[PDB]
Amino acid sequence: GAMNSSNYAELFNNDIKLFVDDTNVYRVTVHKTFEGNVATKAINGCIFTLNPKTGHLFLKIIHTSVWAGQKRLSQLAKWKTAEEVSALVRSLPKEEQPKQIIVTRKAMLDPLEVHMLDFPNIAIRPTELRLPFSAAMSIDKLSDVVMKATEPQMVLFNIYDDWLDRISSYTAFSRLTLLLRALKTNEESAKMILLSDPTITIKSYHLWPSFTDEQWITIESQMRDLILTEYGRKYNV
Amino acid sequence: MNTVPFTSAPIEVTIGIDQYSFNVKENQPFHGIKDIPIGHVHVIHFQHADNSSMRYGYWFDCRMGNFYIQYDPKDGLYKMMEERDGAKFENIVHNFKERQMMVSYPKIDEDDTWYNLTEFVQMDKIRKIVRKDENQFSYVDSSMTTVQENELSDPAHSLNYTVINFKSREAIRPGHEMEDFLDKSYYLNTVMLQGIFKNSSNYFGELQFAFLNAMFFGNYGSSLQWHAMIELICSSATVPKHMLDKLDEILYYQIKTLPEQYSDILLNERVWNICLYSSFQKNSLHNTEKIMENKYPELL
Ligand SMILES: O=C(O)[C@H](NC1CC1)c1c(F)cccc1F
Numbered sequence: 001g002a003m004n005s006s007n008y009a010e011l012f013n014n015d016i017k018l019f020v021d022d023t024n025v026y027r028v029t030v031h032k033t034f035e036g037n038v039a040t041k042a043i044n045g046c047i048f049t050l051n052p053k054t055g056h057l058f059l060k061i062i063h064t065s066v067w068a069g070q071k072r073l074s075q076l077a078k079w080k081t082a083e084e085v086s087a088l089v090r091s092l093p094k095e096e097q098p099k100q101i102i103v104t105r106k107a108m109l110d111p112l113e114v115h116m117l118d119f120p121n122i123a124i125r126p127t128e129l130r131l132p133f134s135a136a137m138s139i140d141k142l143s144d145v146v147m148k149a150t151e152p153q154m155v156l157f158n159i160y161d162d163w164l165d166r167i168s169s170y171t172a173f174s175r176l177t178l179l180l181r182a183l184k185t186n187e188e189s190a191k192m193i194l195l196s197d198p199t200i201t202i203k204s205y206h207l208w209p210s211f212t213d214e215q216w217i218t219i220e221s222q223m224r225d226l227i228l229t230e231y232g233r234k235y236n237v
Numbered sequence: 238m239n240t241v242p243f244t245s246a247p248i249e250v251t252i253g254i255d256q257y258s259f260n261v262k263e264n265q266p267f268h269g270i271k272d273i274p275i276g277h278v279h280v281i282h283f284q285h286a287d288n289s290s291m292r293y294g295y296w297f298d299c300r301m302g303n304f305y306i307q308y309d310p311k312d313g314l315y316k317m318m319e320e321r322d323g324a325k326f327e328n329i330v331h332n333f334k335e336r337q338m339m340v341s342y343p344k345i346d347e348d349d350t351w352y353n354l355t356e357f358v359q360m361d362k363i364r365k366i367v368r369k370d371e372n373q374f375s376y377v378d379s380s381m382t383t384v385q386e387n388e389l390s391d392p393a394h395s396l397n398y399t400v401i402n403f404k405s406r407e408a409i410r411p412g413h414e415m416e417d418f419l420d421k422s423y424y425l426n427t428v429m430l431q432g433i434f435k436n437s438s439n440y441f442g443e444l445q446f447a448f449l450n451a452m453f454f455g456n457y458g459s460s461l462q463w464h465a466m467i468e469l470i471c472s473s474a475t476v477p478k479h480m481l482d483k484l485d486e487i488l489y490y491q492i493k494t495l496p497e498q499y500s501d502i503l504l505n506e507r508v509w510n511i512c513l514y515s516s517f518q519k520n521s522l523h524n525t526e527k528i529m530e531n532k533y534p535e536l537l
Contacts, residue, residue, distance in 0.1 A: 079415035110404070114414045117406050
């Protein structure tokens with residue numbers, strides 16, 4: 001059923017699973033019209049589908065053309081997400097298909113379940129974790145590929161870079177969620193933490209800087225400090 | 238006008254006949270029910286004074302044979318039986334009528350309630366939902382489960398209602414997932430009406446039968462079925478106009494007849510609010526919406 005703090009190590013066992021986040025699929029800017037009314041202008045979006053054990057990210061880029069002439073776009077976005085996730089699963093060899101798909105927003109449950117009726121042995125589940133995956137578009141290289149796309153496209157990343165050579169997937173996921181929570185909390189400050197130092201670079205085939213083990217501890221501490229502060233600033237404590 | 242005689246009444250029992258009911262005392266000289274209107278199905282049902290567990294009863298049509306009730310002290314219930322000897326039967330009935338040992342089906346001549354609750358209900362369709370083919374009448378009780386319920390356990394004693402499931406491949410065309418889930422017109426009109434039921438009268442008959450089993454026996458699987466069949470119509474953008482108008486009448490009379498003290502377990506708040514206020518047909522059920530709002534405004 002629902003996923004929470006009690007069954008948290010289940011994410012890192014050997015049953016293939018995917019998180020799906022739809023929060024960046026349908027994205028708009030709201031602006032005034034010449035007549036003084038308000039209109040939206042869609043921009044490119046993405047489905048964030050992540051294997052938390054391996055770090056494999058299936059980034060489906062949602063080009064604005066998919067909304068042309070469509071109504072009720074925020075509802076359509078959930079069904080388009082489910083259609084794309086279902087298509088991804090069918091394209092995977094059987095032994096690579098997930099045994100569970102965990103959606104970060106409960107509104108995705110019915111669209112995904114309907115689209116996956118052919119896969120009765122794939123459990124569709126919600127979660128009670130407050131995951132920071134909406135901040136994925138704060139990762140510069142992910143933002144860049146989404147905004148440059150001129151057509152629908154699927155782009156594959158490893159969101160853990162090479163971390164699994166030195167740490168477990170539990171630790172890698174905690175690191176990822178901390179980085180992304182910080183980015184979602186105060187993007188500018190988070191990005192300053194990560195890039196302040198010109199001598200630590202991002203390899204061309206990576207998303208995050210090449211921190212040593214010792215530097216990651218420092219970075220992680222800084223992200224905690226950021227989040228705990230913003231938490232006080234907002235509630236005053 | 239036809240007659241269901243009783244051999245006797247050895248245990249104290251509340252007997253129902255359609256929407257009427259009366260109390261019989263242990264060993265009271267009660268020998269049955271007379272003046273039963275021909276042309277409609279009927280249900281004769283029982284609640285023992287000593288056991289409010291298990292309401293049970295029999296659906297029947299007096300045109301299909303001569304039926305009587307006889308208490309069975311082994312199985313502990315009043316059993317319907319068919320008498321094949323027609324002269325024996327007339328002779329028994331005439332004697333008990335002459336002794337005035339029968340209650341009269343108490344229909345008021347202005348009253349179309351029973352017809353309105355059973356307009357589309359036929360014995361031949363009841364007998365396919367309730368499989369017991371050596372008998373012309375059909376036994377139902379509180380505890381019988383539906384075919385759908387057993388899929389989620391004795392099959393002989395089940396209610397074989399048409400399975401409706403909104404998240405099923407039958408309900409959802411490949412490539413039309415969003416369309417068919419948010420507009421059930423395909424599932425209603427092609428799958429169910431054209432494919433399974435053949436016409437809306439058979440659809441309405443099963444819906445009316447489901448409600449009546451829910452109301453008279455507290456059969457929970459029947460209540461589920463009634464609500465599912467309503468929800469399927471209400472959630473379809475495209476419904477024949479005559480079906481909407483008839484649905485409104487059907488439901489009006491069901492809501493009018495439901496005991497007020499059972500409304501909290503026989504009416505599903507989610508379905509009714511969706512149907513009257515959110516669905517495609519939210520403005521098509523004027524009679525039903527008006528009675529629901531004046532009788533059960535709390536639910537909503
Ligand atoms: O309002 C919060 O509790 C806080 N957001 C504020 C900007 C700090 C927060 C977290 F720090 C972590 C997870 C979810 C949250 F909503």
